[PDB]
Amino acid sequence: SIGLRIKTERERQQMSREVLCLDGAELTVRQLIRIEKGESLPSLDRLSYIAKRLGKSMTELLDQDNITIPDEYYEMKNRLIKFPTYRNPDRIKSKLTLIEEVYEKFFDILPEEELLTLDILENILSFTSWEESPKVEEIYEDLFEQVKRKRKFSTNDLLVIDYYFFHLYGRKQYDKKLFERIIKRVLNQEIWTDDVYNIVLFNDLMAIAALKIFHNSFSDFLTVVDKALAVIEKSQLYSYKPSVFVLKAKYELLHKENKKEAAENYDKAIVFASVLEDSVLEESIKAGKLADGL
């Protein structure tokens, strides 16, 4: 099978043995024939070169129990990550329904990291209030404790932080110094090319800005807005820019005491939501504008 998996993948990419072997400085076409036919067992050196040429890892090439995650999972994961509910109960119920479909179909083949992402996302979507929903410590003791000690955050680290921001929103009494540590570390994170990572990072930046507004602590507020813009500018995911205009509208109204400039930023978010044809977002921005005395 080791020679058959190499031959099958080589022919899948419409690659000849000569192109794979190049100048023969690392592997000759003669020996590639012996490897694919099974006449010789490829050493780790040549198999490492074959893997590099084929774009596959050595693990993918010889793993007997290798299971492959179907495209339907990532299609369902794309709908769970990329379509903002904006806390709409119908969009939340649909995603919670989709999460249950994903679990019953792929649990046996998904690694622990992917199941942890679906688990945290399930608690984030189904969040009701800091009182009723499970506390971050109760379910994510180890993950949140590591986040306290961790300098660089992963996707699941940012998801736990988001669930922590959901519990932190309503409480008047809270750990103020711990919240200041998380802000500086989230602002210190580097923007990847992974859209899932950047989307969750953007969510944390939106939750930080929302928490500063509830606390009326507008220090470093423009820094969060700038990083939220930087995420949008690098991923070109403009479905989230209306939420940035709402942040600037809140900043002009509550901190700069400029109502005319706050209403103009609100109008830019409404126009942005209209051209995106997201009526749920457009209706939410117009309701927030009128509730803000505008």
């Binding site: 990550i81 509910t85 921001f165 959901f166 939750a207 939420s243 942040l247 927030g288």
Partner: peptide
């Protein structure tokens, strides 16, 4: 959390 922070 407000609606604009619910980007998931």
């Amino acid at each position: 959390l407000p609606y604009f922070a619910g980007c998931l």
